[PDB]
Amino acid sequence: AKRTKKVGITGKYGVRYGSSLRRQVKKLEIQQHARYDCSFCGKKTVKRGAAGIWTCSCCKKTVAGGAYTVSTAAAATVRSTIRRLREMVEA
Amino acid sequence: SINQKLALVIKSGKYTLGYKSTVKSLRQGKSKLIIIAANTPVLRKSELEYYAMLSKTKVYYFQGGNNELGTAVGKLFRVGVVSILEAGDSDILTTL
Amino acid sequence: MRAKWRKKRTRRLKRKRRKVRARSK
Amino acid sequence: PKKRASNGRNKKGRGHVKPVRCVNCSKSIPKDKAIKRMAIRNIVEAAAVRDLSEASVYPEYALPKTYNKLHYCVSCAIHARIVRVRSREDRKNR
Amino acid sequence: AVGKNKRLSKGKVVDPFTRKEWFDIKAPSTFENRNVGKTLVNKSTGLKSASDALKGRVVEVCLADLQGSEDHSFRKIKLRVDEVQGKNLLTNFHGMDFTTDKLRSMVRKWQTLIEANVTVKTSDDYVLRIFAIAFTRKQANQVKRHSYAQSSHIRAIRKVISEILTKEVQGSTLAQLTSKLIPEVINKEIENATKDIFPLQNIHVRKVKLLKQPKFDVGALMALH
Amino acid sequence: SQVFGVARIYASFNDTFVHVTDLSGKETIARVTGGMKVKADRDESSPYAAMLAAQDVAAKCKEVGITAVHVKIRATGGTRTKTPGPGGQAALRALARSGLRIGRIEDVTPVPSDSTRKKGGRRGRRL
Amino acid sequence: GRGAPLAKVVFRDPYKYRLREEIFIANEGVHTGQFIYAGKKASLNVGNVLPLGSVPEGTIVSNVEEKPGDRGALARASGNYVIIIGHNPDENKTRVRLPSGAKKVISSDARGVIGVIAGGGRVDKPLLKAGRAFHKYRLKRNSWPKTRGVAMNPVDHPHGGGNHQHIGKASTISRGAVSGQKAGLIAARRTGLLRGSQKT
Amino acid sequence: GRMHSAGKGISSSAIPYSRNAPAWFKLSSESVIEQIVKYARKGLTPSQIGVLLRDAHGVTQARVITGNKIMRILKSNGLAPEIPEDLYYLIKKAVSVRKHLERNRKDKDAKFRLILIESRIHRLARYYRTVAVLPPNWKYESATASALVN
RNA sequence: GGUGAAAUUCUUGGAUUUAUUGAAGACUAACUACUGCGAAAGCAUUUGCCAAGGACGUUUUCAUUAAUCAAGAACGAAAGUUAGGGGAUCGAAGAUGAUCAGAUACCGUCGUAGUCUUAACCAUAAACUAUGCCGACUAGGGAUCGGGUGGUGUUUUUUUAAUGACCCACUCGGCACCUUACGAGAAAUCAAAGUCUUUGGGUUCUGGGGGGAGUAUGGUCGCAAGGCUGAAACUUAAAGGAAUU
C-alpha cells in the first residue's frame, strides 16, 4: 500500500535521530535484514543471528561473514587474491 | 552448448528428476547418463559415482548449482540430480 | 564584462535573498 | 564567422580526442590539435663530424641519429615562427 | 656560480683514486672476444673488502666489442659480475637491451606496431620475459602507402610469437640461449613460421631482461669460464 | 690496448653535467659540471660553461689515467624537457678534443610512457 | 564483548586418546563442517594456521603471532588483516603490514591465520539511542557514561573550575609528566584537523 | 532503415522472374512436401528449414512447387509452434541479456541494449495481437520470460 | 632549484648526481593518421570470460509489423555532495618570494579540498558539424576503413596445392576530402545550407527589436550547491549578422 514513501525501514524511530543519520541507518538495516541463500543448497532462507553470524534454517551450515553482509567486497577480493596466490604457488 | 542438448533430450527422450527416481533407476540400471550439480554436498557426488561404477554408467559433472540446473532442464522449479534413461533424438551418449 | 560574472552576481543575489526569506519564513 | 572547413583541426566523426601537454608552455592541447614536428637532427652538432672522428674509437661508422616529436601550442607556434598566418588564397594549402 | 654559497655546512683533501685498483672484466665463452675491459674498485680492506662491493655489479657493453663484427652494433649485454677469481672477475648474462637510438629509427609512421610479451622459464630454472618487435612492409608493386594490418591478423601473430618464443626457450639452458640470440637464428624462423600469414620485416627482440635466478651454483660459472 | 670509461653527459637547462664513470657505474670520477665555471648564473647552459667544464673534466681524466670513455648524453627527461640542453654538443666536442677517444655515442635520457602529469595547469605556463 | 565471532574447532590429540576444545576467531567463509588444516605443510586456504615462514608475498593473513608460542598477538579484531611484504631467507624474519600502518619485523616461525576475520566493517552504522551504547559497553567494562573534565570541579579534575567553560592551561601534556595531570592530549606531536596525508 | 541504429547497410535477396522455375526440377510435389514435414518433425524452425532445403535439394522456394509458402503448410499438418517464430527468437535473446544483467551490474550498455529488445517484443506482440495470432489478452512478463523459451 | 633578470627554499647531517633495489599512487607515450567504434558523453598495455552492435552475402522466414515524437523513461564530460578505501604527482583555498605607486593576478616554492576507486546523488557545457529525424533525385576525380566478387595477376613454402599480403576492375555501407556551380544563400560558403515565389514528401521542437532577464513569483526534482517551467512593470531607436578602405 506504500504507507511510507521514503523513510523505509526507519519508521520505528519516528521524527528523531536526524535525516542523513536515519538514512545511513536505513541502508545498513535493509542490507542487514534481507533474506539470503546458502552457497551449499541455494535456498533463499539464510538469516542473521548475532554480529557476524549468518545462520540458515534449511542448509543448517552456518558460515561466518560480515556483520551486515554474507561476504563483503573486501572479503571477495581477499578470497580472489589467495586463490590466485596459491594458484601461482602450485603452478 | 550443453544446455541445448539437455533441453533436446528433455523434449524428445524420457527423463527422471530428483533423489528417489535417480537412485531407483540406478538400482535397476536403466539409466545411461547422470547429471550432478557442483553445489551439492560431496557425499552426494561420491555415492552417485559409486552407484554408477557399480552399474558401469557414465558420470558428467556441471559447473553450476541447483537453481541453475532447474533452469537448464527447462523447468520453473529446481533440480539437483538429473538422470536420463533414453536419449531418443539426441546424441549425448555419443559425445561427452 | 563577461557572462559568468553576471551569473555569479545573480546567484549571489539569490543566496542572500533566500537567506532573507528563510529568516522571515 | 567560420574560418576553416575542418573547424578546429580535423575533428570529424570523432567528437572527442585525448588531450596532450605542450613541450614549451605545458598547455593541455588535443592530440590532433597540437602540431607535431620531427626532430631528426644528429646527436652531434652541425658539421664538426671529423673533429670527433679523429678521436673516435673504431673506424667511426657510428653516425647516431636522435629522433623526437615536438608538441606545440598555438601561442607557442606563432612565437616560434614555425607556423605563420597565411593569406586567404594561401590558407587552402596543406 | 661559485659566489652564491651562504650556508656551506650545517654541522659546523686526499683523493680516493690512490686506493683504487684495476680489475679486468671477464666474459663467458659464448662470445669469442671476451676482452670487456677494466673497472675501478676501492682497496680490499677489513671493513668492507673489494669482493663484497664487487659481487653485485652490472656492466653494459655493446656487442661490437664482444662479438667483433660490425653487424652486432645495435645490441648490448648488461653483463653482471658474480664472482672474484684473483684480480679477474667472472660475469653472467643478466640484462639485455636494444639500443635506444635505433628504437626511434625503427619506429615509423604510416604503419601499425606490434607488441608481445611472455614469462617463460628455461631448463636450468631461469625465468625470463621476451619482448619482440615487428613492423609491416611495403611490398613490391604495392601502391597503397599505409601498410596497415587488419589488427585481427595481429591477434594471430602475437599468439604465434608468444607460443614460438615459449617453445624455443623450452629445452635450452642459459648457455644455449646465449649462443642462439646473437646469431639471430630465431628471427629467421619467425619469418619461416609467419611467412604464410603476413609478410612482415624487421624481426628483433628489445629486452631479454632477467628477473629471478637459481641457487649460486658456482661450479656452473667455471664451466662458462 | 686502451682503457675505457664512461662519459655520462647530462645536458639540460640551466646546467650541463659531465660525469666520468667506470664501466660498473658506481665509481665516480671528475664530478664537475658546467655551473662552477661562470659567475653569472645565466651562462651555465651556454657553450662557454660547457667547454670550460669539459676541460676541467679532461684534466682530471688525464690524472687518473683514463684514455677513453663511452658517452651517453641525456637530458632532464621524464615530463620536464625531453630535449637535450644547448650546452650538450659543445661540452661533448670540448672534452673529446683534449686527448680523449670517444666511442659508441648513445642517448640515455629517460622518456616516460605518459606517466604522471606535468606541472603548469591546464593553460600551462603563461609568462 | 568481542564483535568478531569465535569458531569452536576440535582437534585430535596425537599423543593420547582425547579430543580437545580450541577456540578460533572466525574468518570469512568459514562454515561448520569445513575441515580446517593447521601446520607447516598445509595448503594456502582461508582459515589455515600456516606459519609466516612458508607463505608467498602479499598474502592476507590474520591472527599473527609476535613470537613462537604466543597463541594470538596481532590482528584479533573484526575486519583487520596483516599483509606480508617480504621474507628474509637468512636470519629468517618477515616484514609485515599491521592494520595501524607501520613497519615491523617478526620471526618467520610465527603462525598466522589466512584470511580476514568475520564481522568486517562492524563500525559502519551509528548507535542511535543511548540504549545501544549502554548495551555495548555494559559487557566490556565500566567506563560509560563519561563526564567532561572542563565542566568538572577543580578538585576532581585539573580541567575544571572557573565561572566559564574553559581549560585554562595548555591541554597538551608532556610524556615526562607524572600520573595525576595526564588529562587531555599526552605527548601530542601536533593537533588540529588532520588535513593532509598520514605520512606513513 | 536500421530500426535501432543509424545505418543504411543493404543486404537483401532477389528472386528470379520465372514463377515456374527452374524448368529442370524433377521431384514431384508430393515428394518435396514429404521432405519439409520430415524436417519439421525434427524440430527445426521454418527459418532453418528454408536454408537446409535450399542449399541441399533442387528446390529454392517451395512456393513454386507446393501450393503456398513453407509456413502455411505447417498449419495444415499441425506441426506449428505455439508462438510465432519471430517472438521466440528475440525472447530467447532477451533472457540472455537479462541473465547477463544478473551476474554483473556495471555494464550500462547491456542495460541500454536491453531497452532495444523491449522496444521490439511489445511492438511485435501488439501487431500479432492485432492480427489475432497471440491471445487477445497476452502480455509480456519479465519474470515469466524465462518460461517462454521452454 | 629556478626566471628575461631575481627571490623563497634545500645543502659537512652531503644538497644535485652516479650504481643497486624496495614501497606508493597516476597514465597506457613513441606506433597515433582530415585514421578507427559507440546514440552521446566517451573509448588509445598483455591475456581470459560474458554478452551486445554496425557492415558484408543469401533464390532462408514473417509480413507492412513502417517515420516522427506531448506527457513519460535510460545514459550523460568536467566540477560538486554523502559514507569508505586510497592519498605518489599536479593542484580552486591558503601561507609565502619577487615586480608594480598599488597586485590578495600573470612569474617561483610549499600546500588543504580535489584529481584514483567503491556504493548513492548531482541531469549541467562552445554537450558545435553552432546545420533535427525519415525517404527519393541531382556535375565530376582520387585517396582511405570494413566486406564481397572476378581476373593461370605479382608474391609468400615443401617454385606449386589453399591460406596471408598486395595489384587490377567493380560493388555496398562508412569517416570524409579535391575542382566547379545548373541551384541556393545577405555573403562568409554549401553536393547539402540544392530539388523555396516555378512557394506543398512526412514529422517533432524553438524565436518575433535590443535590455530588463533567463530575472520576480508560483509549482516541481534534489541532503544542499543547484535543475525544469517561467513572466510583468519599466526603458531605448537603435542593438545584431555578412564584406570593404
Curated annotation (Swiss-Prot), chain B:
| Cytoplasm as UniProt keyword | yes
Gene Ontology MF terms in the entry: pre-mRNA 5'-splice site binding; RNA binding; structural constituent of ribosome
Q: Cellular component per GO?
A: cytoplasm; cytosol; cytosolic large ribosomal subunit
Compartment(s): Cytoplasm
* Self-association state and partner proteins as the record states: Component of the large ribosomal subunit (LSU). Mature yeast ribosomes consist of a small (40S) and a large (60S) subunit. The 40S small subunit contains 1 molecule of ribosomal RNA (18S rRNA) and 33 different proteins (encoded by 57 genes). The large 60S subunit contains 3 rRNA molecules (25S, 5.8S and 5S rRNA) and 46 different proteins (encoded by 81 genes).
Similarity annotation: Belongs to the eukaryotic ribosomal protein eL30 family.
* Source species: Saccharomyces cerevisiae (strain ATCC 204508 / S288c) (Baker's yeast)
What is the gene called?
A: RPL30
The location annotated for the cross-link Glycyl lysine isopeptide (Lys-Gly) (interchain with G-Cter in ubiquitin) is K14, K45, K75
Its name, as the record gives it, is: Large ribosomal subunit protein eL30
UniProtKB/Swiss-Prot annotation, chain D:
Q: Which residues of the full protein are shown?
A: 2 to 95 of 119
Q: Where in the cell is it found?
A: Cytoplasm
Principal localisation: cytoplasm
In the UniProt record, the gene name given for this protein reads RPS26A
Ribosomal protein in keyword set: yes
Q: What do we know about how this protein assembles, alone or with others? A: Component of the small ribosomal subunit (SSU). Mature yeast ribosomes consist of a small (40S) and a large (60S) subunit. The 40S small subunit contains 1 molecule of ribosomal RNA (18S rRNA) and 33 different proteins (encoded by 57 genes). The large 60S subunit contains 3 rRNA molecules (25S, 5.8S and 5S rRNA) and 46 different proteins (encoded by 81 genes). eS26 interacts with eS1 forming part of the mRNA exit tunnel. eS26 interacts with TSR2.
From the Swiss-Prot or TrEMBL record, give the protein name: Small ribosomal subunit protein eS26A
Provenance organism: Saccharomyces cerevisiae (strain ATCC 204508 / S288c)
Family the entry assigns = Belongs to the eukaryotic ribosomal protein eS26 family.
**Function recorded in the entry:** Component of the ribosome, a large ribonucleoprotein complex responsible for the synthesis of proteins in the cell. The small ribosomal subunit (SSU) binds messenger RNAs (mRNAs) and translates the encoded message by selecting cognate aminoacyl-transfer RNA (tRNA) molecules. The large subunit (LSU) contains the ribosomal catalytic site termed the peptidyl transferase center (PTC), which catalyzes the formation of peptide bonds, thereby polymerizing the amino acids delivered by tRNAs into a polypeptide chain.
For this UniProt record, the keywords arranged alphabetically read as follows: Cytoplasm, Ribonucleoprotein, Ribosomal protein
Curated annotation (Swiss-Prot), chain F:
Which InterPro entries would you find in this protein's record?
Answer: Ribosomal_uS11 (IPR001971), Ribosomal_uS11_CS (IPR018102), Ribosomal_uS11_sf (IPR036967)
One GO term describing the cellular component: cytosolic small ribosomal subunit
Q: Which Gene3D superfamilies match?
A: Ribosomal protein S11
Principal localization reads cytoplasm
Where does this protein reside within or beyond the cell? Cytoplasm; Nucleus, Nucleolus
Q: Where is this region: Disordered?
A: 107-127
* Compositional bias of kind Basic residues: 118-127
Which terms are listed as keywords in the entry?
Cytoplasm, Nucleus, Ribonucleoprotein, Ribosomal protein, Ribosome biogenesis, rRNA processing
Q: Does the keyword Magnesium apply?
A: no
GO BP: cytoplasmic translation; maturation of SSU-rRNA; maturation of SSU-rRNA from tricistronic rRNA transcript (SSU-rRNA, 5.8S rRNA, LSU-rRNA); ribosomal small subunit assembly; translation
Listed GO MF terms: RNA binding; small ribosomal subunit rRNA binding; structural constituent of ribosome
Any extra detail in the entry? Present with 3370 molecules/cell in log phase SD medium.
Q: What does this protein do?
A: Component of the ribosome, a large ribonucleoprotein complex responsible for the synthesis of proteins in the cell. The small ribosomal subunit (SSU) binds messenger RNAs (mRNAs) and translates the encoded message by selecting cognate aminoacyl-transfer RNA (tRNA) molecules. The large subunit (LSU) contains the ribosomal catalytic site termed the peptidyl transferase center (PTC), which catalyzes the formation of peptide bonds, thereby polymerizing the amino acids delivered by tRNAs into a polypeptide chain.
The record ties this protein, via NCBIfam families, to:
PRK09607.1 (NF007176)
The record's comment on protein family reads: Belongs to the universal ribosomal protein uS11 family.
The protein in question is named: Small ribosomal subunit protein uS11B
Q: Which gene encodes it?
A: RPS14B
Curated annotation (Swiss-Prot), chain G:
Does this UniProt record's set of keywords contain Acyltransferase? Answer: no
Q: Name one GO molecular function term.
A: rRNA binding
What cellular component terms from Gene Ontology apply here?
A: cytosol; cytosolic large ribosomal subunit
What keywords does the record list, in alphabetical order? Cytoplasm, Isopeptide bond, Phosphoprotein, Ribonucleoprotein, Ribosomal protein, RNA-binding, rRNA-binding, Ubl conjugation
Signal peptide span per the entry? none
Post-translational modification Phosphoserine, affected residues: S43, S107, S108, S197
Q: What does this protein do?
A: Component of the ribosome, a large ribonucleoprotein complex responsible for the synthesis of proteins in the cell. The small ribosomal subunit (SSU) binds messenger RNAs (mRNAs) and translates the encoded message by selecting cognate aminoacyl-transfer RNA (tRNA) molecules. The large subunit (LSU) contains the ribosomal catalytic site termed the peptidyl transferase center (PTC), which catalyzes the formation of peptide bonds, thereby polymerizing the amino acids delivered by tRNAs into a polypeptide chain.
This chain belongs to the protein called: Large ribosomal subunit protein uL2A
| Species per Swiss-Prot/TrEMBL record | Saccharomyces cerevisiae (strain ATCC 204508 / S288c)
> Source taxonomy lineage?
Eukaryota, Fungi, Dikarya, Ascomycota, Saccharomycotina
